[PDB]
Design a protein around this ligand. Structure first.
Ligand SMILES: O=[N+]([O-])c1ccc2c(ccn2[C@H]2C[C@H](O)[C@@H](COP(=O)(O)OP(=O)(O)OP(=O)(O)O)O2)c1
Ligand SMILES: [Mg+2]
Length: 903
DNA sequence: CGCTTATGACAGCCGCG
DNA sequence: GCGGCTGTCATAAG
């Protein structure tokens, strides 16, 4: 196999690398790296090296990296450009591995761990680490074993060993329900003193040193605490044994209240799963506790225990240890579904960066671009400093608030990257400028053609057509990858819908799930072989089909992020290729393209229809058009379709067979007009929306910008057995809405779109008749706790103090004194509830840490003073009234004046 | 060491016989 | 003591 790296670091004058060798063994190196930077030199000098603008450079070899950095600052102390790759880690990798990296994951040691700390006086701060570590579970990627480190004796009590035979039993038999799949993979190790325990962990750590270190919340807790606990007991020197090269950096990002520690272990790449999730899940959550994410992702109930967590070790040591084991396991199960560690590995090696740099789009692209240039012997510019400056972005159409019965939508495929490609926008391909007309002229085809020789954006920039730019080229690679994985995702989605209507009646039979790849459309044979399978066999395939969709979704949506992030970096001041002439060339172009095709669509439909001046496009956001399909149905008359599924097929045909050909013509005209390299504006048909036939439902509605709802029958080719609701921007999609109100409002919209006026009023009445009965958590709002300190003012609301922050302050007053009570942490999410006049807390609202239940200290008082009437009014009634007004419905029953002749 | 556009819940202030 | 507006903040749609 080819050689590949693990972790690279720079410690002084040397580079420390871990890597896999010729055969597959892990090694280490200390390379006194001699780097090469560049300087501009006279044209008269013959050379091999040129920068991106063509101007000639001379290479400078350095004795060491320390002299190399000295030279750079000396070059700016004088005012001359210091060219080349200033991050020597990246250059060193580029030198050593001057080829495309293939890697074997079975060789990479990925470690998942979690620790436990008993603490009778509140949450144990990693800074101090004053309380003892009584348990650690440590999963090893290569051994495939769960290493358990128990502690039997502690100043907070002494306990007998943990039983593997009891942990395996169901919780209904008084066991723990540690899953069977791992019962044979646990390695148990009891310890009689903490020193003995921690001492063993490090020797263990030494023989099995993690390359990739993951786990739940390990950056903020586990790592700092095992580092600091060891520090307090064995001294700072012994702690450094956590780092393969014995170097660690400590970062005290101390809050306005308490301390906060971030340790950096050199030679290890830490990827906290909480961070991976936040970056790659594309889901804003009300809580980020492991129990919450597990329930959400896996449908597995919480790890139940009696009494306070602090005394769980004392009360029930068996459960304690078992729950530590399961906690590590859940992260593994989530990852098995989300593929975030795999995703991180692909990107990190593709760009030749430190794996933990996957979180930075600026770094990832800087490297990709850097390497791409290096192979053509090109020299990269110096990273200048720039002042932060707002610049114009996309165009969003102002829609007339209303209902819309039949709607059809179209969306441009990676609009911003395609603009980059079409127009050939790159730092070194800048040709010149032209004098700009008002954008409407360009939209209306009125303005004079900008150039007949270069590639033009309506912001006044010109580009060469003759060559290829690094940006357009490198962006096309990741885009093609994204296009691939989107095809599988859409396939398994289409596949799933075939399995989903196939359990409208499964055969009573005993068989086995078919052996197929869900990444592809089922062939006519297997399509026919499906409905011949059983419920138990279909529920298995359905689940697998969705597993592959989930995994394909991950792969696609994140490649889409990275390519949109290249445009983003162009508009970021720390990016080497920061250039607002390029950033605005993109957005201005998009503003034009969207409005151009709006005009053009309104034309082809006026003609095809017969009428004149009709606005068919009701809405648009950035690169999307929403088309009023009503008048196109009128031509065929309302009643001429046997069932719902007929007007969907018809419209899908009218779109693909008629509209898209018209669109494709409309854009190449724009292409000619802007004289671009290659026509790359393709509109993919998205949604088909409307009510069921013979139903009083309304189909869809808009309330404003970014806020609308639609009843969708086909999304991007995928035909649904059951119609799904496309809901955007409304409260049902916000993580700040209470969970019960999310569901209730989703039901109101479904009854509005699919069934009609009457159906709505029925659900409204019953819900508010039952609202008082719901679990308080399910009807609490959610907000994030930012800048608590700013409005603190002795524990009372200061000037301009936000509502949720107010709730936080009133919470802190009530719990003051009792140090065991859960503290509210800066930056984290909180539950918020309104309070009734003259309550014991002496303020109008309370807030506590989210994902949790409130402490028995105040729990009953607050539950007892909850303001159900305000809660229902603001979280539920106002939003509904919002939807209703736009839909022009009632949800109630107004002054009938029929009231008199009732009965 | 590292994107803009937009809505809504609130605070605060202002006019209002 | 309520609506209109501006600004801060949380959070969505791209
Ligand atoms: O820096 N960012 O993080 C960033 C920058 C720009 C971004 C986005 C998210 C969207 N855009 C811009 C650039 C996109 O091309 C355009 C429209 O987005 P979209 O949701 O329609 O998806 P596309 O990127 O067009 O691709 P798709 O339509 O095939 O999904 O809106 C994110
Ligand atoms: Mg798009």
């Amino acid at each position: 196999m080819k050689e590949f790296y693990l972790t690279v670091e720079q410690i002084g004058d040397s580079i420390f690398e871990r890597y896999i060798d010729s055969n597959g063994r892990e090694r280490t190196r200390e390379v006194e790296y001699k780097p090469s930077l560049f300087a501009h030199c006279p044209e008269s000098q013959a050379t091999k090296y040129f920068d991106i603008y063509g101007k000639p450079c001379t290479r400078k070899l350095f004795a060491n990296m320390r002299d190399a950095s000295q030279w750079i600052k000396r070059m700016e102390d004088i005012g001359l450009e210091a060219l080349g790759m200033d991050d020597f880690k990246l250059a060193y990798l580029s030198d050593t591995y001057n080829y495309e990296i293939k890697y074997d994951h079975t060789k990479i040691r990925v470690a998942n761990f979690d620790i436990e700390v008993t603490s009778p006086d509140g949450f144990p701060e990693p800074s101090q680490a004053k309380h003892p570590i009584d348990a650690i579970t440590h999963y090893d990627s290569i051994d495939d074993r769960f290493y358990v480190f128990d502690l039997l004796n502690s100043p907070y009590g002494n306990v007998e060993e943990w039983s593997i035979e009891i942990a395996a039993k169901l919780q209904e038999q008084g066991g723990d329900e540690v899953p069977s799949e791992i019962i044979d993979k646990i390695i148990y190790m009891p310890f009689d003193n903490e020193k003995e325990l921690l001492m063993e962990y490090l020797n263990f750590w030494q023989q099995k040193t993690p390359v990739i270190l993951t786990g739940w919340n390990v950056e903020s807790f586990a790592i700092p605490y095992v580092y600091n606990r060891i520090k307090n007991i064995f001294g700072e020197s012994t702690a450094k044994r956590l780092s393969p090269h014995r170097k660690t950096r400590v970062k005290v990002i101390e809050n306005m209240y308490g301390s906060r520690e971030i340790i950096t272990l050199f030679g290890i790449s830490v990827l906290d799963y909480i961070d991976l999730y936040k970056k790659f899940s594309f889901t804003n959550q009300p809580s980020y506790s492991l129990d919450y994410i597990s329930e959400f992702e896996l449908n597995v109930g919480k790890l139940k225990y009696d009494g306070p967590i602090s005394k769980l070790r004392e009360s029930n040591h068996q459960r304690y240890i078992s729950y530590n084991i399961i906690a590590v396991y859940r992260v593994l199960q989530i990852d098995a579904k989300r593929q975030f560690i795999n995703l991180s590995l692909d990107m990190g090696y593709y760009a030749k960066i430190q794996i933990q740099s996957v979180f930075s789009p600026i770094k990832t692209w800087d490297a990709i671009i850097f390497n791409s240039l290096k192979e053509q012997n090109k020299v990269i510019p110096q990273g200048r400093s720039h002042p932060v400056q707002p610049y114009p972005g996309a165009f969003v159409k102002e829609p007339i608030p209303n209902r819309y019965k039949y709607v059809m939508s179209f969306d441009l495929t990676s609009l911003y990257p395609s603009i980059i490609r079409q127009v050939n926008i790159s730092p070194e391909t800048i040709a010149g400028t032209f004098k700009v007309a008002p954008l409407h002229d360009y939209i209306n085809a009125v303005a004079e053609r900008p150039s007949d020789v270069y590639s033009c954006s309506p912001n006044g920039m010109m580009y060469y057509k003759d060559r290829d730019g690094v940006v357009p080229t490198e962006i096309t690679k990741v885009f093609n990858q994204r296009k691939e994985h989107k095809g599988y995702m859409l396939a398994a989605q289409r596949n799933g819908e075939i399995i989903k209507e196939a359990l409208h009646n499964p055969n009573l039979s005993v068989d086995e799930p078919l052996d197929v790849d869900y990444r592809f459309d089922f062939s006519d044979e297997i399509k026919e072989k499906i409905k011949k399978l059983s419920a138990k066999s279909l529920n298995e395939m359905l689940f697998r089909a969705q597993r592959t969709e989930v995994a394909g979704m991950t792969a696609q949506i994140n490649r889409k992020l990275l390519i949109n992030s290249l445009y983003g970096a162009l508009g970021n001041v720390w990016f080497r290729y920061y250039d607002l002439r390029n950033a605005t060339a993109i957005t201005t172009f998009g503003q034009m393209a969207l409005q151009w095709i709006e005009r053009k669509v309104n034309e082809y439909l006026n003609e095809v229809c017969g009428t004149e001046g009709e606005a068919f496009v009701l809405y648009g956001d950035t690169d999307s058009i929403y088309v009023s399909a009503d008048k196109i149905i009128d031509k065929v008359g309302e009643s001429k379709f046997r069932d719902t599924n007929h007007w969907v097929d018809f419209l899908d045909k009218f779109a693909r067979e008629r509209m898209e050909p018209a669109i494709d013509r409309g854009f190449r005209e724009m292409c000619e007009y802007m004289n671009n390299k290659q026509h790359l504006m393709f509109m993919d048909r998205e949604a088909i929306a409307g009510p069921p036939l013979g139903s009083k439902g309304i189909g869809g509605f808009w309330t404003g910008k970014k806020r609308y709802a639609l009843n969708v029958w086909d999304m991007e080719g995928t035909r649904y057995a059951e119609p799904k609701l496309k809901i955007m921007g409304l409260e049902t999609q916000k993580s700040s809405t209470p969970k019960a109100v999310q569901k209730a409002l989703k039901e109101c919209i479904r009854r509005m779109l699919q069934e009609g006026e009457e159906s709505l009023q029925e659900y409204f009445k019953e819900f508010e008749k039952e609202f008082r009965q719901l679990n308080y958590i399910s009807i609490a709002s959610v907000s994030s706790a930012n800048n608590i300190a700013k409005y603190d003012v002795g524990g009372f609301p200061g000037p301009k103090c936000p509502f949720h922050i107010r709730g936080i302050l009133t919470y802190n007053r009530a719990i003051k004194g009792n140090i065991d009570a859960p503290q509210v942490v800066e930056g984290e999410k909180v539950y918020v509830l309104p309070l009734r006049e003259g309550n014991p807390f002496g303020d109008k609202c309370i807030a506590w840490p989210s994902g949790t239940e409130i402490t028995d200290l105040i729990k009953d008082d607050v539950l007892h003073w909850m303001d159900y009437t305000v809660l229902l009014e603001k979280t539920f009634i106002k939003p509904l009234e919002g939807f209703t007004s736009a839909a022009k419905l009632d949800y109630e029953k107004k002054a009938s004046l029929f009231d008199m002749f009732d009965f």
